[PDB]
Design an enzyme around this catalytic site. Structure first.
Site, short mmCIF file in Angstrom:
data_model
loop_
_atom_site.label_atom_id
_atom_site.label_comp_id
_atom_site.label_asym_id
_atom_site.label_seq_id
_atom_site.Cartn_x
_atom_site.Cartn_y
_atom_site.Cartn_z
CG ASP A 8 34.77 31.12 39.17
OD1 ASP A 8 34.90 30.78 37.98
OD2 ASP A 8 33.74 31.68 39.62
CD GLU A 10 38.52 29.78 44.78
OE1 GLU A 10 37.53 30.15 44.11
OE2 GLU A 10 38.49 29.67 46.03
#
Lengths: 603, 299, 603
Positions: free
Chosen positions: A297, A339
């Site tokens: 992330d 991400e």
């Protein structure tokens, strides 16, 4: 010696990707071996019940550059232990960074977390799944992921989460019935603050105690594998939790932190030791826990930092590149997902083409555009048509996973259901359409807990999902719609290929009525998608098609089984050998309110 | 039983017997329990053994003695050690249900909470300690309403229980302590057998420090009880055990989850092979203030 | 000595039902006692590594009742032994009939099994199960048995079965997921031919080596109990295995077999039937039943081929059977005995004092034969055989029956249950769910053999593991899901617990053309309605009389999409219409899906 001269040589090189094999606490029949990385330490000692917490009982001996090693007889599995590091005038107690299990001595994590001597012996029964998993080949296969917070999902009793073991059978039964291929787990690594959701990590090598023993998590993953489901773990190489006890200022000075003046909690990718521990943790989860995937992330926070004057943190970019390279070398069938909320090119690209080396990238652009489009009221959707159509332009720059996640259903952003405009029927209709277009749109699929039934409430980690909503018909219909979507996804290969190959536009110019028609095709097989984004039904709507003959209605969002009005085309539509949308034939169809129609030529 | 020839009412004694005989004949799985504050023998014994035929008897002896010991200030508990330890000479005369009831919290006798001495934290500790001992002690368990939060006032029937006290930490904590106590009782078969085989003494002579250790066993299963009845924590305390090897503490009354000081044994407690209390091995433990420690060997 | 005067007295009587306390090999720390019954032997000696396999080192002494005993110093657990018996001119090596464990010293797939001195000590933790276990009272409780062959169920590796321990956690996990109450294990007693499935037994007192030691099996049963699952053992008193060193001609003469030359001839086995006339045979056999219930905490015993025992009428067999059951329930009041009798011999499930055989349960093979015969037919033809389906209810209350689908029915070219059903794959799965639906609705307890719950294509092959790979396909996971939900219904709704005639009501049986059946299952206030369509043609506006009016809910529909069905049903609440039908005051107007069962509950 506990440490070979090769062992020290690779730690200095940053090539010790097995470092979990040697660092941390390693049980032996009469004693535990202890190994710590502490380059700027003058002394290091292991403290525990096994020595009445005596700092001089078992002082560690430096075995190489910045490594301390020593054996303690009588330290046995299940004992709590501690490192006492001395920085000149001052000494401090620290946790094991390589701890394989941690437990709170107080009983509450936020007051204290302590290292536990652990043996990781586990007998697996997932051989069959291991050979089966595609990995890189998965790009051509269906990848549907159910995102989960294990504590938040279901509670046995109000406010009590399911154990690793207790969750296994309910989750496995749940995931198969709805047809998801993998479960993506929010970070399970040991973390002090439950409210962090696991993203502020103190124990990278320890599964969180909240759900049981390490072997319990091993059992869960094993259980899911036998049931044919993959497990993707969320991994946090960007930053580390702020604990006086853990990681930060390990030697009394900067160690995992940058020496140069989530600031101060960021990993120093310059240090060979830091990459060693970080890339070993990546391999650790794939090795000892048979994990199928890792999702990183906030990648952009790694890539940038805000004569040289360069914002790109080049340290991190090479760490990411060498991270991805190492995983696929040791695990050719793993999956790595990132991400990254910047338009950094080639996140999903191979390192040898100057890519970051991930297999998948979150299509957050798509998620933003699609969601922004669907909160607008259908009366206004006329005026924002380009936001729907434009998503395809960028739908092929990366291997992408369409993503709906906790991030979008929290902090006053509202439930997915809450996001949709109008009354309850329309909200269910809008949500059914969103998922319909999402499954039809190119890219793999990820949906977070509770979105599958259209939950009212925002996701609360202190609470369990509103499963009582499954008594209401609309929520059950949304769950069935998603179930039926995954079944079509798993069976029709026209949806497996998310390249420009698999997508053809049928029509994008109906702005007044806000309708879009597109095609999905692998080889001979094709699937037709017609989408009515307005509650006004459309009658005798013609849609051009390549092949003539009888066409079948494979799915109708508006079917009563999903909670819809039931308007539809009754199974068979006959193609008319009349030109439409620049196509040889056309189907004249009825478009139900706020509904997605999936049609197949008849075979 | 007694009208006060003899003082006994034999009418009643035959009625009681024929009562129990009839019940168990028509409903073989019913339960009859008796409260008898005289020491009438064989209350729980079968009529054919000349008993009254109840299945269970309230252990009023245990409660009176136990409560009397708890009421005394810990400084004085030193001098009444024989009161606490001697309860078990009588714990097997009948099938017994240790009982705390409405009768003990009425007519100025005071709440169980009120019965406990010292400051507020100490009242919760003592009250938590008692319940620990009531569950560890041989016999089934009975607790009346409101004792599970440790409510302040005597039971008032014209009104409601003090549910508002469930917000304050000490009282929500005693409720949590009881919940886990019942969970341990339900799951561990070492506590199901209230016979003498089911209980073994570990040590009873730590009378100055007012510490008591006993064991509850069924076959392979063992449960170890160490009780600190003084606000002094005790460190490096050794407790003999039958078997060596790894031991874990399954319950600690002083855990923060219950509202306690938070001392205890977190890491694995491994047995030391040195004889103690006439036992082959021993554990060196830390006893928290006014706390009960329950320990299980690891499997 | 070893044998008290009471012990010889009981053996002569035929009353030594704990005879394992003294017979076989009983270890002592210094040495092992040996006691073997061989009345017509002139000499008997123990041979083993503990005496250089010399026959004259330790000749057992003849006591009374043909019993031999002797002590051997240095004979220790794990030592292998054999009895050397001399019958006049001839001598032979024989195995211990009371062997507590047998093992191939060779390790070879085809090998002699050698009796091994064994200690049966084990500490049990199944306290709660045995104190709350209910035998004969289970007549009014739900009993759902999963029949299992341990080697065939799952394989740890190709061609390698799971240990008693290794299987424990996987089997218990699987059974709980599908909701079965008991597992029936095909004979685990030591058997030479793996292909016999255990029905050719040599070591009645020894668990088979293939899955581990005795303590492993005790552990497996213990574990299953803690998990809330019962263990029923298949027991074979009808005949013993033909192996030359085994029970055949033990003392050099007939011992376990009939002395008479003529009444040895037997059609099912012959020569290898037990002579129930002999008190010694009665001792050996009845002690063995108690042995397993005592030393292995077994919940039940199921005797096969009882018809082979009753007829040659064999009064001695029947009195053996009667005294078997009488003795079992005398020592274990909560045990269970099940019989399969392929004649219509009356009162199998009846108590001895009523002139019954004394089993608690009888396999309902009449039900099995009829139902399968009816469903083998194509829906077009079922019209003409309607009586075969309905007339099962004329016979459903003669005994306490367990409706049975067994390994016997899915082998030797009889075809897998899946194979037996007609039509295309959707139709076969639809029909299989209907058969399972009807079997659960029909009065009686339930038994299903491994592989039926997912509808395995292939016949049961003992050399392999079930085709678990089929669990990927939609139809097979659905049938398994349907079985789980049927079992969930079975365990919770008490209307199905009472298989008495009070518990069943006919609603309609005269729909022969459309091949539909409606019947009712009731206990006191509780009601369950069953509507069954045995043709792929759906029927709409079908009226079904009901006893009670008002709102009715559909609790289960075999045609639900979650089960692999078309998805037709009666959505949510159904309201009874105050107009008479089927001689009933109210009726429900329903839609009957193809090849489907509806189960309906008043609201």
């Amino acid at each position: 010696s506990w440490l070979t001269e090769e062992d020290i040589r690779r730690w200095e090189s940053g090539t010790f990707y097995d470092s979990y094999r040697k660092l941390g606490a390693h049980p032996d029949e009469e004693g535990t071996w202890f190994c710590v990385w502490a380059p700027h330490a003058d002394a290091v000692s292991v403290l525990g019940a096994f020595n009445n917490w005596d700092p001089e009982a078992h002082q560690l001996e430096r075995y190489g550059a910045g490594l301390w090693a020593g054996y303690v007889p009588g330290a046995l599995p299940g004992h709590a232990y501690k490192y006492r590091i001395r920085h000149g005038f001052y000494q401090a107690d620290k946790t094991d960074p390589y701890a394989f299990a941690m437990e709170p001595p107080t009983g509450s994590p936020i007051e204290g977390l302590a290292s536990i001597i652990t043996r990781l012996d586990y007998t697996w029964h997932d051989d069959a799944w291991m050979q089966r998993r595609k990995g890189p080949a998965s790009l051509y296969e269906p990848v549907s992921i159910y995102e989960v917070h294990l504590g938040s999902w279901r509670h046995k009793q109000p406010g009590v989460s399911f154990s690793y073991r207790e969750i296994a059978e309910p989750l496995a039964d749940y995931v198969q019935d709805l047809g998801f291929t993998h479960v993506e787990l929010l970070p399970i690594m040991e973390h002090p603050y439950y409210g962090s959701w696991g993203y502020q990590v103190v124990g990278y090598y320890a599964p969180t105690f909240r759900y049981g023993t390490p072997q319990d998590l091993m059992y869960l993953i094993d259980y899911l594998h036998q049931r044919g489901i993959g497990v993707i773990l969320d991994w946090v190489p960007s930053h580390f939790a702020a604990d006086p006890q853990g990681l930060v200022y390990f030697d009394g000075t900067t160690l995992f932190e940058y020496d140069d003046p989530w600031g101060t909690y960021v990993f120093d990718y310059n240090k060979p030791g830091v990459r060693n521990f970080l890339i070993s943790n990546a391999l650790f989860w794939l090795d000892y826990y048979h994990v199928d995937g890792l999702r990183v992330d906030a990648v952009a926070s790694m890539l940038y930092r805000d004569i040289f004057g360069g914002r790109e943190n080049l340290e991190a970019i090479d760490f990411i590149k060498k991270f991805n390279e190492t995983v696929y070398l040791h695990f050719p069938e793993a999956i790595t997902i990132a991400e990254e909320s910047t338009a950094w090119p080639g996140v999903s690209a191979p390192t040898y083409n100057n890519g970051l080396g991930f297999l998948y990238k979150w299509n957050m652009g798509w998620m933003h555009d699609t969601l922004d489009y669907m909160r607008r009221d259908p009366v206004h959707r006329k005026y924002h048509h380009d936001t729907l159509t434009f998503s395809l332009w960028y739908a092929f720059s990366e291997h992408y996973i369409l993503p709906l996640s906790h991030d979008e259903v929290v902090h006053g952003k509202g439930s997915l259901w809450t996001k949709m405009p109008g009354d309850d029927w329309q909200k269910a209709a809008n949500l059914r359409l969103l998922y319909g277009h999402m499954w039809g749109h190119p890219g793999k699929k990820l949906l977070f807990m509770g979105g599958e039934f259209g939950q009212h409430h925002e996701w609360n980690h202190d609470t369990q999902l509103e499963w009582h909503l499954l008594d209401q018909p609309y929520h059950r219909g949304i769950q069935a719609w998603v179930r039926d979507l995954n079944h079509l996804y798993r069976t029709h290969p026209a949806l497996w290929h998310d390249g420009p190959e698999g997508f053809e536009w049928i029509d994008f110019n109906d702005r007044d009525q806000s309708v879009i028609c597109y095609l999905r095709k692998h080889t001979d097989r094709l699937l037709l998608f017609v989408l009515n984004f307005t509650p006004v039904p459309r009658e005798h709507y013609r849609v051009g098609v390549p092949i003539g003959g009888p066409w079948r209605e494979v799915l109708n969002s508006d079917a009563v089984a999903y909670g819809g009005s039931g308007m539809g085309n009754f199974g068979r539509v006959e193609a008319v050998p009349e030109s439409w949308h620049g196509r040889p034939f056309h189907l004249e169809l009825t478009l139900p309110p706020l509904a997605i129609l999936i049609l197949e030529p008849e075979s």
